[PDB]
Design a protein around this ligand. Structure first.
Ligand SMILES: O=P(O)(O)O[C@H]1[C@H](OP(=O)(O)O)[C@@H](OP(=O)(O)O)[C@H](OP(=O)(O)O)[C@@H](OP(=O)(O)O)[C@H]1OP(=O)(O)O
Ligand SMILES: CC(C)(C)c1ccc([C@H](Cn2cccc(C(F)(F)F)c2=O)NC2Cc3ccccc3C2)cc1
Lengths: 102, 102, 102, 102, 102, 102
């Protein structure tokens, strides 16, 4: 997108949820002086790309075409139980098994 | 319901308990021009969906038709580490032996 | 007392200490319009039932009628080093051992 | 003690360190209307008893008669890396060995 | 580097995201009275050495020459589920294997 | 120490990084009433002894005579993801290995 402040850097921390950040990506767009085509594009390309790898891995898992409502339901668990319950055990139970890796 | 800010996005944080969020859902509802029925429908359909996979996993667990008194009570340990006394110990002990999942 | 803001909903949080809730419950009772016996009925009836599973499980353990000095201390362990150093960490081996559960 | 607020209940949270609370206990003493000796008695009896089982277990370990400088330095470890590193690990391997407990 | 309060110690906290700190590194460069060449130099020379081993280890992961955009995406992995779940799931299970180490 | 607030004992919280505690140790030295030599004498001794057992052990571990700059980078690695990744990884199996301890 490249529009100042609004999308070149609007990013989601790790504790910052996918839900709170989308506003950081929207409310901030309101600040950029862009055309609606300039913004809507910014919501498709830069949203998924510059936002929280816990969830980007979910945005490419759900994959494109997911409405934000889809990236919303799944990336809601970003957090200690929803995601982290599944994130700690995936690496923990994988490498333990590292003699054989699927 | 699709009413501004409340049912379009009122949400429950992964650290935010079933109570703080319930206050929000109830609060921004006072911000949308809504009748008594406008809000009663808004509670059942969105609260369960747009709210923290922890409580959301409990609300379905409660079985629809359970008064909020129950969504409150069951989702009380919902919590920062609270509910999770059951969430981490399971994910950490079901996947742990080899591959057996029950 | 079924008093507004004070009992019907006063509730201790998960990340929350027995203190601040006890303070919430206490501090607000003056705020309700009740009779003296009523309030006393709340300190004994609600304070245990509507507060923080790390600690509620304790209150039910030390038991009703136990001096607050006793409730306090045990529930002051709630919170990382006191209650936490013990329980899930033990829950790891309770379900690992799940073939046999005592 | 019984002097209003200061020593009847001044308590140390679980995550709250020995210094943050000791400060509460001290400062709150300045506010009570106690004789010089009243307060002196209070610093001893209530500082060790109503303060965070992590540090309280330490104050008992150091042994009564230790100056606060000693209670302080020792209790500073209360916290995740210094005190928690030790108890989680010990509680974990002490009971794992459960057939034999020393 | 040694320029006024910018590079003397601008350091990323262990829990401070790369993103949050880097600003303290940027705006401070803006905040000092340096020449344009000094600051450009201060970016590469100083941002990596003084930036939180979680990310200072990532800046090693990208491999020098990566545009900061790469440092941004990569260090965005700094965080609990992405970078902490890897050091928690890796370091714990590696040394466990200490009979044999690769 | 004995100078006001600064060196009598200035202390670091567990989560308090070397940037939240030491910074205090710095800003506060400008306030303590010390001779130019005093402060130089106090910046060495008190800084290492009264600060965060993780980092305190680091400052002693690098070995005296190291520049503080050498203690700063070296103590910026205090922290859960960074520092706890290393000690959490070891303490758990250090004792598991208790049949043989090296
Ligand atoms: O900082 P501590 O006193 O050592 O304890 C913390 C704290 O728990 P408390 O609610 O009891 O204060 C965190 O709470 P937050 O303020 O981060 O919400 C909790 O977080 P979670 O509920 O999200 O798990 C965290 O756990 P973690 O470091 O896994 O985020 C847990 O630390 P311990 O599990 O290490 O005791
Ligand atoms: C090993 C130790 C650090 C001590 C430990 C173990 C596991 C717990 C908790 C389980 N548990 C235990 C006591 C009190 C509560 C409270 F206060 F939070 F309700 C609670 O949930 N379950 C976490 C919830 C959570 C969140 C994110 C990552 C891991 C876990 C496990 C906390 C601490």
């Amino acid at each position: 997108g490249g529009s100042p402040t609004s999308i070149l850097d609007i990013r989601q921390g790790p504790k910052e949820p996918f839900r709170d950040y989308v506003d950081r990506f929207y409310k901030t767009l309101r600040a950029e002086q862009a055309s609606q085509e300039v913004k809507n594009w910014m919501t498709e390309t830069l949203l998924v790309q510059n936002a929280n790898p816990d969830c980007k891995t979910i945005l490419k898992a759900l994959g494109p075409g997911a409405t934000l409502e889809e990236m919303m339901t799944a990336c809601q668990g970003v957090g200690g139980p929803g995601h982290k319950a599944r994130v700690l055990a995936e690496a923990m139970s994988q490498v333990t098994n590292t003699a054989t890796i699927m």
